Design a protein around this ligand. Sequence first.
Ligand code: FE2
Length: 187
Amino acid sequence: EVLKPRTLADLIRILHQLFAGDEVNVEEVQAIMEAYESDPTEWAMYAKFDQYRYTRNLVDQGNGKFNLMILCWGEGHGSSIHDHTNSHCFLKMLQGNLKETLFAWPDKKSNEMVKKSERVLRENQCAYINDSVGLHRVENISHTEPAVSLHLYSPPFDTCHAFDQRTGHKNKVTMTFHSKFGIRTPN
Ligand SMILES: [Fe+2]
């Protein structure tokens, strides 16, 4: 009985409704994002890759309630271990596959970080994370094919922390957009 968006535009319209209010039903959003069948014809205009690192490509600003963006992972590209700055964070596969590794939070002592979970996200699957769930690292499983994912963050945020797996020490990172609405940013 999940409402099924027929197009990426349908999905955006539904998301505007689900985030209009004060309450957000996480499992409802997750099921609707998963029900959208990834269609490259609809999102190729956002799929702008870089040789060396993954790119973040803004799709929609959600009337200030959320940011919807597409992340393009080249061959072998991966993220650092990071948090999500107290926001809801949804990630849905559009092409290829990402491995998500969940980590525990470090405390004050210096120590190797501890893995809590490890999985590969399947075709069209939508995962969810927030800071109470843990930290995570995401990476393209493939060294021969790209991965593309659709990310929804609410509230939007443009800073996070990256964590050193060897010690748990963290550094603030400013996140930037490679493109917005299909247009390359100055960089
Ligand atoms: Fe993340």
